[PDB]
């Protein structure tokens, strides 16, 4: 069992694991059928660009809030500011998310601008007549790329005023740590007659 | 501790054991082989010191049985009132917590105290309960 100087292994193979073994032999064939499905879908929706327009949106956690990415759909407030109803936007190819909110003006303005450029770039056909054929592109995401915002300029002047940025962090942590005991002492000082 | 373990074969006659959480004193020990190949079993017959009941247990010989600590202590009577003896220790300590005996020992002790002998009382402690077992008279130091 235990033997020479080796690391302790944890290999979870004490069930009937050979009954559930999935070997992906069909990677290449599955990729080929996936491309076939994309091509037949594009031929079925032959003018339309195979994917909806997605908003730019800020990634959730503190690990990833430095980055911006694509969302599910646009806010109703965003599409009302763009100047078209949610039902009409869904019919002309704009993803609408009824359950996200706008708390950030920069993200709101970016999504409104993105909707303005989409409405400038598309051609909407009449529902009855001529259908003036227009040589589809296949990726609204590639025609409207998601761009990371420029946060600063690359050269500035040094503005130093003596706080060292370590004392500031330490004092902020200390006042958060000793917040509630200070209002407890303040409350008992106030109710001390 | 109040009680300490022991082995059944280490036990012998006129020794104290714990049987069914009672302090007991052995009167009989008998060992018989279980099977020809097997170890012998010890059959123990003992008497409770306080109540006088007969309790028996059989066990493997290698098994460990619980054994109490029994202390016998010597005192002089002061008074017998309301069924509670009052005793007097060497160095002058006094206890009244002992209840008087209820049997023929208690009757003989009551008559002896009524007719006025100086009575020497032996009381035993085992597992937190206290009783008086015997009384004599002081032949000297009257």
């Amino acid at each position: 069992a235990i033997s020479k100087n080796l690391p302790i292994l944890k290999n979870h193979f004490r069930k009937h694991w050979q009954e559930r073994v999935k070997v992906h032999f069909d990677q290449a064939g599955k990729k080929v059928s996936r491309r076939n499905a994309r091509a037949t879908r594009a031929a079925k929706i032959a003018p339309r660009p195979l994917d909806l327009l997605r908003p730019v949106v800020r990634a959730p956690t503190v690990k990833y809030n430095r980055k911006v990415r694509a969302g599910r759909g646009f806010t109703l407030a965003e599409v009302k500011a763009a100047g078209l109803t949610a039902a009409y936007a869904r019919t002309i190819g704009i993803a609408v998310d009824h359950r996200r909110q706008n708390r950030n003006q920069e993200i709101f303005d970016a999504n409104v601008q993105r909707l303005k450029e989409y409405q400038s770039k598309i051609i909407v056909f009449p529902r009855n007549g001529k259908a003036p054929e227009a040589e589809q592109v296949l990726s609204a995401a590639a025609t409207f790329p998601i761009a990371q915002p420029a946060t600063d300029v690359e050269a500035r002047a040094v503005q130093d005023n003596g706080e060292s940025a370590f004392r500031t962090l330490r004092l902020a942590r200390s006042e958060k740590k000793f917040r509630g005991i200070r209002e407890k002492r303040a409350r008992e000082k106030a109710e001390a007659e | 501790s109040a009680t300490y373990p022991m082995q059944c074969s280490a036990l012998r006659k006129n020794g104290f054991v714990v049987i069914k959480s009672r302090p007991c004193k052995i009167v009989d020990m008998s060992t018989s082989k279980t099977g020809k190949h097997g170890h012998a079993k010890v059959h123990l017959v003992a008497i409770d010191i306080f109540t006088g009941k007969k309790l028996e247990d059989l066990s493997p010989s290698t098994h460990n049985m619980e054994v109490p600590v029994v202390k016998r202590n010597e005192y002089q009577l002061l008074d017998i009132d309301d069924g509670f003896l009052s005793l007097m220790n060497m160095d002058g300590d006094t206890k009244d917590d002992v209840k008087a005996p209820e049997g023929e020992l208690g009757d003989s002790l009551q008559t002896a105290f009524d007719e006025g002998k100086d009575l020497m009382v032996t009381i035993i402690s085992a597992m937190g309960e206290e009783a008086a077992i015997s009384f004599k008279e002081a032949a000297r130091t009257d």
Partner: protein, 216 residues
Amino acid sequence: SKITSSQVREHVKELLKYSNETKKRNFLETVELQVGLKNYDPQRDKRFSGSLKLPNCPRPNMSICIFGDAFDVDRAKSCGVDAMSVDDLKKLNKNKKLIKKLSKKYNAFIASEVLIKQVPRLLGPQLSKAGKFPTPVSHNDDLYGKVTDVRSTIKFQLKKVLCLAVAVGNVEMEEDVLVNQILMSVNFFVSLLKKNWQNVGSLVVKSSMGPAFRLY
């Protein structure tokens, strides 16, 4: 402790206010603690008995007799305490009326280690019936020191009645001393008592010729 020191301080304050100023008495008034214990049986439960020595004496002048040998009587001449010898006890010759008179004469008795054996044989069991039994003293110890000790003794013994009483001290002592002595006596009582602070029926502080005051 259910009883609090500030409540003890308060109750001691009106107690000494009544005893000293409003109705002064010519005899010196002893402060009494009268206790009653609850959910307890004298017949089945263990009969607790214990004693503590207070730092400042409750009764300085209470009568004490020293049964003693030659050395004990010679020391008792220096102590100034009443004594009868073994020859005197033999004189008495186990006569019930005179020994009852002695038992009602002296509240406390101090006896030597040698003679404490035959104190029951010369005197009989009526001392144990009264509850005044002689306390042992040795040649090494100081008799007057143990007289001060016995005069400062506080004893709790169960007996048969479920209510006890002791004398904490005098009215004339200082307030902090009275508070400390009553607190240590209540603590000693609950230390002797099993299942402490819940088998306490009632605690009453009183002064001699004074009304009762109830501490829980």
